Design an enzyme around this catalytic site. Structure first.
Site, PDB file in Angstrom:
ATOM      1  N   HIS A  67      -6.364  -7.108  -0.981  1.00 30.45           N
ATOM      2  CA  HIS A  67      -6.528  -5.681  -1.203  1.00 30.45           C
ATOM      3  C   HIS A  67      -5.726  -5.211  -2.405  1.00 30.45           C
ATOM      4  O   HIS A  67      -4.701  -5.792  -2.768  1.00 30.45           O
ATOM      5  CB  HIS A  67      -6.079  -4.864   0.010  1.00 30.45           C
ATOM      6  CG  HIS A  67      -6.822  -5.186   1.268  1.00 30.45           C
ATOM      7  ND1 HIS A  67      -6.331  -6.049   2.221  1.00 30.45           N
ATOM      8  CD2 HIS A  67      -8.022  -4.763   1.725  1.00 30.45           C
ATOM      9  CE1 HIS A  67      -7.189  -6.131   3.218  1.00 30.45           C
ATOM     10  NE2 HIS A  67      -8.224  -5.360   2.941  1.00 30.45           N
TER      11      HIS A  67
ATOM     12  N   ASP B 151      -4.890 -12.954   3.030  1.00 32.69           N
ATOM     13  CA  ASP B 151      -6.179 -12.452   3.491  1.00 32.69           C
ATOM     14  C   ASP B 151      -7.300 -12.689   2.478  1.00 32.69           C
ATOM     15  O   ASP B 151      -8.422 -12.227   2.701  1.00 32.69           O
ATOM     16  CB  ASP B 151      -6.109 -10.968   3.903  1.00 32.69           C
ATOM     17  CG  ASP B 151      -5.425 -10.060   2.899  1.00 32.69           C
ATOM     18  OD1 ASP B 151      -5.037 -10.484   1.794  1.00 32.69           O
ATOM     19  OD2 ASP B 151      -5.292  -8.864   3.254  1.00 32.69           O
TER      20      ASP B 151
ATOM     21  N   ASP C 155      -2.724 -10.490  -2.870  1.00 26.34           N
ATOM     22  CA  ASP C 155      -3.339 -10.036  -1.631  1.00 26.34           C
ATOM     23  C   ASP C 155      -4.790  -9.639  -1.888  1.00 26.34           C
ATOM     24  O   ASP C 155      -5.142  -9.168  -2.975  1.00 26.34           O
ATOM     25  CB  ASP C 155      -2.537  -8.852  -1.058  1.00 26.34           C
ATOM     26  CG  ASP C 155      -3.052  -8.368   0.282  1.00 26.34           C
ATOM     27  OD1 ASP C 155      -4.064  -7.629   0.309  1.00 26.34           O
ATOM     28  OD2 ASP C 155      -2.426  -8.696   1.316  1.00 26.34           O
TER      29      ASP C 155
ATOM     30  N   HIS D  74       0.802  -1.215   0.000  1.00 28.94           N
ATOM     31  CA  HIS D  74       0.000   0.000   0.000  1.00 28.94           C
ATOM     32  C   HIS D  74       0.838   1.271   0.000  1.00 28.94           C
ATOM     33  O   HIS D  74       0.295   2.347  -0.265  1.00 28.94           O
ATOM     34  CB  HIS D  74      -0.934   0.011   1.206  1.00 28.94           C
ATOM     35  CG  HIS D  74      -2.005  -1.032   1.145  1.00 28.94           C
ATOM     36  ND1 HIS D  74      -2.782  -1.230   0.025  1.00 28.94           N
ATOM     37  CD2 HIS D  74      -2.435  -1.926   2.065  1.00 28.94           C
ATOM     38  CE1 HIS D  74      -3.652  -2.200   0.258  1.00 28.94           C
ATOM     39  NE2 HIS D  74      -3.468  -2.633   1.491  1.00 28.94           N
TER      40      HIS D  74
END
Ligand SMILES: NCCCCCCCC(=O)NO
Ligand SMILES: NCCCCCCCC(=O)NO
Ligand SMILES: [K+]
Ligand SMILES: [K+]
Ligand SMILES: [K+]
Ligand SMILES: [K+]
Ligand SMILES: [Mg+2]
Ligand SMILES: [Mg+2]
Ligand SMILES: [Mg+2]
Ligand SMILES: [Zn+2]
Ligand SMILES: [Zn+2]
Lengths: 346, 346
Positions: A200, A287, A198, A162
């Site tokens: 996200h 995740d 991931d 991120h």
């Protein structure tokens, strides 16, 4: 079963914050040290391969991706926060709102907000040391692969995908996958692909290479209309200028299982095939797991064996960097299953 | 001993949040209901003039300043927050960071961050109703002045000058001063000046009128390099387009007393003289006070008598809207001293 080396830093435990802003409360943070310890314990139990500590590469390779002012800020942030009288962990209170100037202030609160995209990534003592060590874990894994190893697992904590050149958030400070990808480029690998599996969106990775065609960035992730990072990750974000058609976001809705998610993986794999990179960096979060506490996909532990196998079939020198994954009792089995599936376990 | 009417809404007490993010902790909020009650009690005690409740003007005059999507968001925010399972008060956790898209997401957390510039302004039940009444308080004081009164005190709570057309923060939701100024414009006052003497920059007021030459915006405030809002309020911000030369920021360092601040007040009054407005709105904060807990100026209680004296000499129809001021012991003396000095007290 083939062997894969893992790079791990005990200095990850220097980052051990007590507070995370979540839903109007200060809660126990999700991105906790037991994540890395549970994974490493599975690496040893499964005898995956040799386990190395990282080399110290310094800030040079970090600063090929991140700005010097941002690197400076992360080194001094905690000491300035404590010297300015604040009693909690370092958390931004205000930021550059829509309509305000992207102007770097003197004040430490102002800079905290300037350099962040969220308030859920508390900084405290050791955050600097741990983020430094995590970048070196990625870089040592890149070195292992560049010097002959087919693949290497960078057991990074904190994660990275991120972080923009000068923005931290989503538990990330340095973008370890971007640093690894840039290291390939600086070492004469002409093309590098970064595949983010991931849950996200890898918004930092997207932004870092957004105007470039030498580094292909692909992410599979939950719909940002619904989940973090909300303001990047949409499928119409295909790149800018020279980077046009060198970014690819594949979004999925809640309850998405592997039988659907892997169709996106296959499209990502075809995009990579036509790009024909010389190296591959996989930003690996688990995740996407069916029991992950903050995510809404439905992958099973066994599905990670299939993910690992599919990635090996790309036939690329491959660096795995650890990103998210927060169901701790399953995280070791899930993450190592990717490595083991890569090495031929089914 | 002249008199001045005050508009006060008991609905302000519908906003009584329990938490404020500050130095990494959730603390007791500074912008507390006793601010409005302490001022009101001093209005009664000094017999300043008649006290009245506001009239309901509806959303019409509010949407002359604020976007319809923003007004809708504030009405539904808390219901959506609770229906989404969050257990704290409504606080944004992430926002449009530098390099992200200003794109309105579906998710409530996403929208909270899109519409805000900080995390210290919790939303809970009653915030909508309190913000509505505060704007009606300012519109009622504007009506009193337009119907023949020299000046009126809008005892606004919550405050407003930090709110942009579609951004909340700094304890503000509807920009009451901007709404009053626009009501002036909509009723045939050719030109209006808004003077912000609150310790903090009126960033929202500036933004709303930034490209306009019919509304002059002036602010005196602490150096935003050092204090909130950090990313607007610098002296090089003088307007854009048709608004160029019709915005004026006057900054001061820590420890500034009235002898120095009143020099900036005089430069502002001279700017008002050459603007020659048909009406004046004063965004009045008494966080300029020597004992204010979050601010670093050194005005005395007696200085507010002098400030009110100086403002009356401008010879204009004048609406005062209450902004900040957080030493609750002295807030009533300080704010009412400004109105009394306007009416000739020394
Ligand atoms: N307390 C806020 C929780 C929001 C989730 C942040 C996303 C972190 C992540 O797992 N990135 O891969
Ligand atoms: N807790 C400090 C957060 C900074 C926001 C200041 C807003 C107060 C104010 O009175 N503006 O007029
Ligand atoms: K992803
Ligand atoms: K790219
Ligand atoms: K001001
Ligand atoms: K203006
Ligand atoms: Mg500060
Ligand atoms: Mg579990
Ligand atoms: Mg949400
Ligand atoms: Zn994730
Ligand atoms: Zn203020």
């Amino acid at each position: 079963l083939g062997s894969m080396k893992t790079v791990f830093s005990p200095l990850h435990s220097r980052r051990h914050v007590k507070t995370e802003l979540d839903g109007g409360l200060l809660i126990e943070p999700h991105e906790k040290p037991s994540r890395a310890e549970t994974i490493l314990a599975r690496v040893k139990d499964q005898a995956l391969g040799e386990i190395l500590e990282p080399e110290e590469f310094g800030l040079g390779p970090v600063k090929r991706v991140h700005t010097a002012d941002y690197v400076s800020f992360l080194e001094t942030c905690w000491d300035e926060w404590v010297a300015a009288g604040k009693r909690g962990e370092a958390i931004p209170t205000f930021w550059v709102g829509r309509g305000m100037r992207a102007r770097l202030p003197k004040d430490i609160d102002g800079r905290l907000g300037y350099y962040s995209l969220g308030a859920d990534t508390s900084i405290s003592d050791g955050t600097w040391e741990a983020a430094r060590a995590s970048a070196n874990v990625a870089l040592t894994a890149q070195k292992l692969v560049a010097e002959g190893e087919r693949a290497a697992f960078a057991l990074c904590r904190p994660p990275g995908h991120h972080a923009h050149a000068d923005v931290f958030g989503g538990y990330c400070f340095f973008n370890n996958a971007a640093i690894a990808a840039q290291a390939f480029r600086d070492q004469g690998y002409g093309k590098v692909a970064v595949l983010d599996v991931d849950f996200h969106h890898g918004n930092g990775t997207q932004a870092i290479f957004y105007d470039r065609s030498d580094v292909l960035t692909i992410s599979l992730h939950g719909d940002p209309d619904l989940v973090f990072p909300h303001f990047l990750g949409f499928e119409d974000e295909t790149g800018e200028g020279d980077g046009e058609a060198y970014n690819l976001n594949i979004v999925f809705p809640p309850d998405t299982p592997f039988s659907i998610w892997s169709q996106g993986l296959e499209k990502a794999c075809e995009r990579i095939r036509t790009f024909a990179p010389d190296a591959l960096v996989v930003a690996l979060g688990v995740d996407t797991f069916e029991e992950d506490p903050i995510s809404f996909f439905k992958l099973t532990s066994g599905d990670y064996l299939k993910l690992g196998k599919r990635l090996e079939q790309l036939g690329l020198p491959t660096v795995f960097t650890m990103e998210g994954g927060y169901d701790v009792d399953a995280i070791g089995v899930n993450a190592v299953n990717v490595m083991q599936g890569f090495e031929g376990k089914s």
